[model samples]
Target: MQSWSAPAIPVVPGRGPALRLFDSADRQVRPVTPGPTATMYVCGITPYDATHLGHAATYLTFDLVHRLWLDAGHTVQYVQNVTDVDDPLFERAERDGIDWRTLGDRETQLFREDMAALRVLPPHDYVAATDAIAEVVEMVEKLLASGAAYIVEDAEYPDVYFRADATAQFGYESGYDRDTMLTLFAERGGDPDRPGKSDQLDALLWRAERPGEPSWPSPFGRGRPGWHVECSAIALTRIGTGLDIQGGGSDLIFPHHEYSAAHAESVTGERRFARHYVHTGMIGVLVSQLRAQGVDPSAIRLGLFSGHYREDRFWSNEVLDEANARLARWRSATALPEAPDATDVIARVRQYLADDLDTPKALAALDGWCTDALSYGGHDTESPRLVATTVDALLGVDL
Candidate 1:
């Protein structure tokens, strides 16, 4: 099944421009510039934890990208995966003495609620790894047949590992040197020093199910999909090859995005799994705490956008207060009965967003406009409605 229901977005009367996003692959700001449709896949929650501020920020970043593409008249094919069967999910459940499925369902539903409250766009294809088991198995089989993957025979559960030498484009996405990638890989759940693996960098494609774990039947063994293959398989099946943009938080830039891209390229024989890789800067969870503090979700979203998407940002009272002030002023102007058209302001905001998603500049443009418009007057101007719609449409904030 797909993800949660999409929150209502205000209908924008005007068109917004496309985005020039920062591509982590080449470390350059490149124009996404899609044709009729822009295909996007963002790594999703693992379903073992609550939706935090960092998750909210990452989703909001992509939500704006989705809205921008929509405003640019592109039918966006957005897909996200729920890693319902990951190791953490099981561990959490085991620690809590509950079923893994129950834990995943609970946390996943909470995440959906959080996203809906924040008015983030729902993905067109919200795939769960548990649901994509068959497809994942098929992809692994193809890799095995092509000699791109090897098997680690266990007495009980044999694991299938991806050969790093299969594709020369492996390190091209992350741009991390061998030592750096290996360090991250070891840190982030890679078996770089596993006893049975061929190369230190080789990653698992299929983990033969261990006792007390969920397993899916495959030609290789009674095992489950590995970390990166789940996304690789789902993306290939849903969006096909050459995804327009693959997005996630900065932490995922390493083994997650890089390995996923490598797995897909090895399977499809394509040089690039994604034409562009977009990674949001890491930050500080925290949706529930902010809500408890009586913070508006829109303000939280604006606070997130107030910083660049590609840099580390910290949430603070100052950031929230500024966002709230921006919201209040904009809302005051919008509440006016008669106001001038904000067509120029809208154009400027769009221009700002198009240039590498410079959201701070976009929000500043609105702040400046609100200051001027509220102080003065614009008769026969549809500024209020235009601003509201622009905020909801381009910014995904219902101010």
Candidate 2:
């Protein structure tokens, strides 16, 4: 097991119910109770086309959860992996005529800047796929030795594949039928139709080296770890077995998150890789597209934060306008004189957050608080300032 340190930021009591998150795996909501620290592994960016509203929404969703955990008076040990090496990264690098590593570095730094601007807290451990190469090799070697994976020797760099039938729990996390699995697996950078595999659903563990691409030395050959195995190895080495939560976008539920769970469980001999699997819904980019057209970053965060994390939402110009207007109202209310008696808004916010992170309801409560503050004069200046401070503390949205 890896030894992890507590987060540098001190925990503060804020508004939230006892944290309960909806697990995508079981399709149910369950309470979260961490021992000393909660372990969270959120699958991170590919670093090619990075930091869109989709990315922002996913990170912000987890950031809220992290804050709630702290508010509940528990420490959190968060880990996120950057896919610094991938087909998209290499392709974009080639097209831009720059080294793949250089491109990844540049784009990743940009993503960091973007996330910081959005006030998302950095993970306790921010790992890169390339940094975990040796660990991945060891994991693949163990899986092959245990017959959980098979080697295809005829390729330029011998390809190693995970045996989908090796464990009956292969598709448990995804809960996708074989048809859906094969269809999406083929469409999403996987060669499900490839010949010479124990099963069609068997995924690539290691890919052989290709000319003009980066390669790493491994027992399999001079190649690189596949997408699924990269996360499995990193999570296993960094976060340990059975994380409190494994999070990512809903799109990753099919093959990426599913495969990571299967691979990690198989490698570590654990029945479950994570206690709860949380996925954020997709953020459609029309309103996000307006960011380049003058929508403020805070407006975008507000727009995304206003929705339930599990539902798909479209970003539109009107949506951004409404978010901006809403923010302006909240700010104006925060500017009101302090109330002499400030009621506890913690229960109001906590009630919504506790019920599977009901952000829209919680936001609505904050809006109501502001409205009430505006209705009352400086007689309640303390409450207005309290609301503002709590909003900034819990949501990280400065008033």
Candidate 3:
């Protein structure tokens, strides 16, 4: 078995608690007793359009998680995929009168550039859905043959569904209440994306043929794998069963993550995909407000991250300049501090990061140290340098 270890944290009982985030219900932040290694799979772009600020925040948050894992001396294999084929691809392709693969490839390239610019580390592997069709098909066959998933040559998926009893155990293991899922499932139009399914909750392991839709040869039929099942096949193949933690945006709690979790668990009989499911809160609240007020987004991003990443910061010209000023101060301080010992400074910074990753809280901690170091030891000195490097190493922040 592949294994990785995170660095040991010098635990403090009451300070910044270990990250326990909102659960499948999106109501409570449940504590996670993490295992040795973290294998995280995030829902990636569908090759639909340019990456937005929302996309940037999600990836950056995972980057922070990855860094934190490494800092804790844990090994992580973070894999994300590009949905190069599916309903969205065929829909856009037919509308634009281009080959579906052509559109998918173009958008995928743009995503790479955008993510790189945002400094989101590339995953250990970036599998395209098109390339994984065979594995997906094999997985579907396994599901069908094993009686976990059923198939009909002519039955529409919305019309037929997975055997409930077979997959019932899968539902319970996700830490979600099944009755709650059924309620939301019906309310949300019962998987409106896929038309031919029978049971409202019956997810598509393999979709049947549709005109102008992407297709691949499989035992089930010549059709694309459903969105949820691809992750099941790819993750099982790459990361193995019994994932330690699965991370995704909160929006995917339902049909997306839920379906994936159910299918994978039903197939493998694994208790949990990942013991911890870490979901980041939303970002880019100011983007719309900026447009509402007719402000530029460039200045908004500058101001937002200038202080820290975790805070719910506002966007304004003054805030933008303050970030600029802080950068200048950090640079100046960097030059002044060469050889220093600031154990207290490091401890304060660690507290800030551990404390709910409170960016403002952590930023204030750094500021306090910088003020003292400069007032006592001058602008360029050992104390300041120690503080700068120490904080960066701990928090993954660049001064």
Best of the candidates, TM-score: 1
Q: Which 10-residue window in model 3 sums to the lowest lDDT?
A: 1-10
In model 2, residue pairs whose N, Cα or C atoms come closer than 3 Å (at least 3 residues apart or on different chains), thus clashing, are: 16-350, 287-315, 337-381, 338-380, 338-381, 338-382, 339-380, 339-381, 339-382
Which RMSD does model 2 reach against the true structure? 3.2
Q: Residue by residue across 1-399, what tens digits does model 2's lDDT show?
A: 111232233333444458888888788898887777888999998988657778888998998888777777777888999999988887898798988888888778877767766777778888989899998999999999999999875655468999888777777787899999999899877887677777888899998888877788886788889899998888888878858999999989988988889988888888888889899898885323454577676677788878899999987777778889888988988787664344555577878877888889888887777777677645764566676666665676766
Q: TM per model?
A: 0.96, 0.93, 0.77
Q: Which is the better candidate, 1 or 2, if ranked by TM-score?
A: 1
Query: Which candidate has the highest lDDT of all?
Result: 1
RMSD of each: 1.5, 3.2, 6.2
Mark the regions of model 2 whose C-alpha exceeds 4 Å error after superposition: 1-16, 153-157, 285-295, 340-344
Q: Report the alpha-carbon TM-score of model 1 versus the true structure.
A: 0.96
User: Which lDDT values do the candidates have, in the order given?
Assistant: 0.86, 0.80, 0.60
Backbone collision count in every prediction?
9, 9, 24
**What tens digits encode model 3's per-residue C-alpha lDDT throughout 1-399?**
111122222322122335544455334446544567767787777886666556656666676566556556566777787778766677788888888888877777766755543345567767887778888877777788787777644554322245545665556433556677777666543563344445546765666677646567766657767777888777888888756556666556665677777777777877666665656545444233444565433233334444444334344567757756665565565567342445565666555555444556666766665566556654334566565555444543455
Sequence-dependent TM-score of model 2: 0.93
